[PDB]
Amino acid sequence: MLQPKRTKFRKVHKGRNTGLAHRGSTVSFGSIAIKATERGRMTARQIEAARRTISRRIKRGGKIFIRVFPDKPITEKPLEVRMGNGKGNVEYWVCEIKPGKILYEIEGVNEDLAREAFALAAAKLPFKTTIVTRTVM
Amino acid sequence: ANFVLNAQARAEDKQGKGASRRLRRESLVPAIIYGGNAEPVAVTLELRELVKALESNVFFEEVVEIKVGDKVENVKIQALQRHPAKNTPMHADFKRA
Amino acid sequence: STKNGRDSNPKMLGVKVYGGQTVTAGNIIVRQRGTEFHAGANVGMGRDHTLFATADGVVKFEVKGQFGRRYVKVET
Amino acid sequence: MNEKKQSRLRRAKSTRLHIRALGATRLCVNRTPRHIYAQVISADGGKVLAQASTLDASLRSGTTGNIEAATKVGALIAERAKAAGVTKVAFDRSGFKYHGRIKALADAAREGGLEF
Amino acid sequence: LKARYNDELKAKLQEELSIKNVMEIPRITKITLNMGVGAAATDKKLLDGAVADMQLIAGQKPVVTLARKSIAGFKIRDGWPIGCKVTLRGDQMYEFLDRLISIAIPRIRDFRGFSAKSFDGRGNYSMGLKEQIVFPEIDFDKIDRIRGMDITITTTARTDDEGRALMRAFGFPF
RNA sequence: GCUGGCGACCAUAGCAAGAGUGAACCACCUGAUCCCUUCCCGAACUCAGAAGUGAAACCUCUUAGCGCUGAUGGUAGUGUGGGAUUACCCAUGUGAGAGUAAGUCAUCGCCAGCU
RNA sequence: CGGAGGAGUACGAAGGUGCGCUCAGCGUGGUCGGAAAUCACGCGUAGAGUAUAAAGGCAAAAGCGCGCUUAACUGCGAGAC
Predict the structure, then answer these.
(1) Which long-range contacts (CB under 8 A, 24 or more apart) does C67-72 make?
(2) Which bases in strand F are touched by protein, i.e. have an atom under 7 Å from a CB?
(3) 3-state DSSP: chain D helix, strand, coil percent, rounded to 5?
(4) Count: domains in chain E
(5) Which helix (H) or strand (E) is D13 found in, with range?
(6) Is D51 helix (H, G, I), strand (E, B) or coil?
(7) Domain span holding position E137
(8) How far apart are CA C27 and CA C56, in angstroms?
(9) B40-44 — which CB contacts under 8 Å span 24+ positions?
(10) Distance, angstroms, CA A2 to C1' F100?
(11) Which of A108, A96, A104 is nearest to A131 (CA)?
């Protein structure tokens, strides 16, 4: 389970998720990649599950690059507790996803195998994705 | 010679955010040509022609001819903007060569 | 229970006279915690880094010097 | 190396800035192992009002590098400044210690009649 | 030395290094002696012993050196004396160096203790000699526990080879 | 045209490398008597000077090598009116940051000395 | 009853003034002495410090030393926040 080793502050504001992904939308490590076409949140458990599925499909014959990291903590109230009395406790970590964000890249694997693995992985994710390949510009 | 792009002029009333969005709804692409010894020129291209040209690897190394009316410019592709989620081309830079 | 919930009263800092306005001697121009602005001609500095006018005239802001400091002055 | 001059200008900076802030006519003096120089400069700091140094034809044939020449240069600058029409000046030692030839020049100017 | 260096060794070094300008000829600038007698906070008399020792050794009043920065592992902290030092220039360093070269190396227990190595890489040479005798000072009587002193020579010689040349011309054992 | 002092301006001006100047000036330089100095030292500050040198240091010139400056076009954001509710679209006004083409080895004032 | 930290003091010098000075880190060499004491020399650098929490500041340093001192005065006070 991915998580920051250390943080400056325990709890952060909710914020708003707007805009597109102008940074991180270009294939840079592998030859083929999967990128999100819709915005949402990605949790550490989802990242782990997708990685495990892809590795099992590709049989550890190539390298997998993970380009999303969960660094935003999310709190929840203990349950059967009334409103007020301070902010809740940290329960899990997420990464904000904007359209165009590349999630995984694969290097050193046949294209059909990579597409099969990505198709398997996409069924575990809470947003719509698409497949891209390296281009000159 | 191998690559010829037909272009129209892009006057000052066709520049800005609204005009560019109208062009892309009409399925054209704005582009800019700059380079040594002359003043930059703004043109517009066709999306299908641009996509077909980019489909081949040799296009990024050769000298291409952009024709707008009677005149003609010999250029090379220098930069390119793509839509982050759809990958459709949106703008192009050409350096005179 | 919580351990937070404290704050201090506001202090109302900031620029009091903007460029192009006329002043009389003694008028306060800038309230600042540190020297964000520095005193130019006909401007004095207080013990809490307040900038005030020492002559009648028109306020002007500029950037000058080798460190690129921001200066305010009064022209007669 | 070069640190002597850098230190000297570092020491001169504070007095020069304070004189500029006060807005007075300045009497800036320079010293070298062979000669002495003195200038009277307007408050804005861009125009020279008067000057005097051992390089003048009167003194250039002498020792030019000791206390006796400093006194004569002080008298000369006092006379020229008084003729030019300046009376109240602030003395600028330019990072040198107020001593020896510097002090002699200042005393000769004061005796000549510049009040400071 | 002194006039010996000025009249003789200048031309000798000039011909040895074949350097055109006379200002390029190396010369020795200063001689620095140091005793860093740590843990003085526990006793406080070894420090006055050390200053008296160097005042005997060299014809100058030594200056005590305080600490900078505090180390908890040792007993040392910021504003107290940790060591002391003397510097020598001009005639004093020439006389001290002459006494060194003449009478120090015979009185030490083991010869060959000094080397032509241990050059800083810019012409300055540091050597630490144990024992405060090998000088014309009072014997074990009237002195506290014996102390060892560091001595650094600083010269205008640019590089190690020129430093070695000047040292050899002056006549250090090595 | 070279040298010194004082300013304007504060990288298109800076840093780094390479080369050059002793007639004058400047600098290194000699000495420690007298004035003055080092929590020790004529190293620094100071005085008395002219045997040496342009080595160092400072000034001057060459170089895009780092640095710095930097368009046009597009993109993001956004005031008003309208249409929608993962927060976007239309009309109208405005418009970055980053990146690209390109540029840069500054430009002026006052006084004094020399050729 | 949102997210994080401090205060209920200290100082006759840690106040005034004149004069003077630059930190931190690293690499080298050098008795005990080492990762790290003190000495000497170079290199890139404000990353040190500012009685105390944080922020805004700090080259005429607002950081650091030395001599003499009591303006840590009395009567006020144009004009502003």
Answers:
(1) C69/C38, C70/C36, C70/C37, C70/C38, C71/C37, C71/C38, C71/C39, C71/C40, C72/C29, C72/C30, C72/C37, C72/C38, C72/C39, C72/C40, C72/C43
(2) 4-11, 25-29, 32, 35-36, 39-50, 52-58, 71-78, 86-95, 97, 99-102, 109-113
(3) 45, 20, 35
(4) 1
(5) helix D3-22
(6) strand
(7) 1-174
(8) 9
(9) B41/B73, B42/B9, B42/B10, B42/B15, B43/B7, B43/B8, B43/B9, B43/B10, B43/B68, B44/B7, B44/B8, B44/B9, B44/B10, B44/B14
(10) 38
(11) A104
The residue that minimises its CA distance to C1' of F73 is: B32
CB B19 within 8 A of CB B44: no
Separation of alpha carbons A35 and A56, rounded Å: 20
Rounded to whole angstroms, how far apart are CA atoms D15 and D3? Answer: 20
> Resolution for this model in angstroms, one decimal place?
2.4
Q: Kindly state the tokens that stand for C4.
A: 């937070």
Four-CA torsion E137, E141, E146, E150, nearest 10 degrees: -10
How many residues make up chain B in this entry? 97
Please give the distance of CA D70 from its chain centroid, rounded to a whole number: 10
- Does nucleic acid strand G have an atom less than 7 angstroms from the CB of C9? no
Domain boundaries, chain D: 2-116
Kindly write down the DSSP assignment for every residue of E41-99, as one continuous string: GGTSSHHHHHHHHHHHHSSS--EEEE--S-BTTTTB-TTSEEEEEEEEETHHHHHHHHH
Residue in C70, C59, C49 with CA at minimum distance from that of residue C16: C59
Given a contact cutoff of 8 angstroms between Cβ atoms, the answer to whether D15 and D93 are in contact is yes
Quick one: tokens of A13? 């504001």
Nearest nucleotide from residue A12 CA, by C1' atom = G3
Residue D92: CB partners within 8 Å, gap ≥ 6?
A: D12, D15, D16, D19, D26, D27, D28, D29
